[PDB]
Amino acid sequence: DDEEETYRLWKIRKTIMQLCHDRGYLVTQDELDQTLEEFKAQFGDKPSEGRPRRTDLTVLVAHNDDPTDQMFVFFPEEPKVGIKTIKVYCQRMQEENITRALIVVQQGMTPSAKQSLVDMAPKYILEQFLQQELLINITEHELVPEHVVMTKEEVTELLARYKLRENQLPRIQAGDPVARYFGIKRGQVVKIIRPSETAGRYITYRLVQ
Template identity: 60%
Template sequence: MDDRLYQIRKTILQMLSDRGYLVNPLELEQTKEEFKRSFAPDGQNISREAMTIFYVKKKDPTKQIYVFFPEDPKVGVKPIRKYVEMMKERQVARAIIVVQQNITAFAKQALNEFSQAKNIQLEQFNEAELLINITHHQLVPKHTLLAKEEKSELLQRYKMRESQLPRIQLNDPIARYFGLERGDVVKIVRPSETAGRYVTYRLVV
């Protein structure tokens, strides 16, 4: 279990770094032994609650994120309500909840209701999804989120509307990894035997 949680936390830290959050390089290089010393208070069992993460964006410190690791195998409404209260106290608008199993139907409904009513974003990942970093797979091309100005320049350059761009679904694993939102545009660079590289753009829908 230690190895599993170690890898999950490592993937989360890589994800946050790729999203532009200020992650200490030393944390990215943390060894399994260091991980256990940090998160196993009794020297034996890893405390998921102690693994809670808080980071800010490099370019905009007002954009902050929590990552929660609930202790309960199946998450209900109560821990979600507790996390929302923590977010309100620190005025944090975004969080990731890493669950061991699928959350209950009531908890899923609560996620949606809290997101709409509290003006926050709550993302959910299963631990199994984070055992490997999908962006490190050799068949996955490089994805880069365009800034708003870059998106406008792209549309002007090709004299097109955003609806004319190829699409990527909001629930696509890559879109979820980068925390993309509807209306975002990603630049995708693939290797090409003839041109060296092949560049495409996709609109998140």
């Protein structure tokens, strides 16, 4: 099909752009709510081996505050991404001086490339995303409260205020869908804001581990 997969691509791009905005990167307002029509006009509306084919809709966006912090969001065509297909991405990453990228796979990316991916983590931090997940923004669901990522200074302020070691906080594991949405690694604390029926608003903190 052509219209259906075009719709899938448009939805995926919208979700990715919302993700980038919530991660603190500079995303313009118009590109954050562009409808299907302008997407078709800009990219082609004929992705059945036509103009709006993948690797043409990749996006590079810089941080809001520091212009030297950018991030790529690639779009492999092969349903099963292999070691070479990510080594080309790594080389493409190396020419510029940026270290963060996102991969949107279509099917289960191969485990050997997973090991290669995790091996190069300290130099270049980059992670994958199944295209099925990105069809919906989970942070919009009614069950999901507002997650906020803390800086080091406010985490230290919190620990000093409640006189508790960081070990004693509640936990959120690194594989959590919201944790992967926010790209948060081990050792970070997330502030969670909830509406409470007995107090009105309750703020709790989760530690990534």
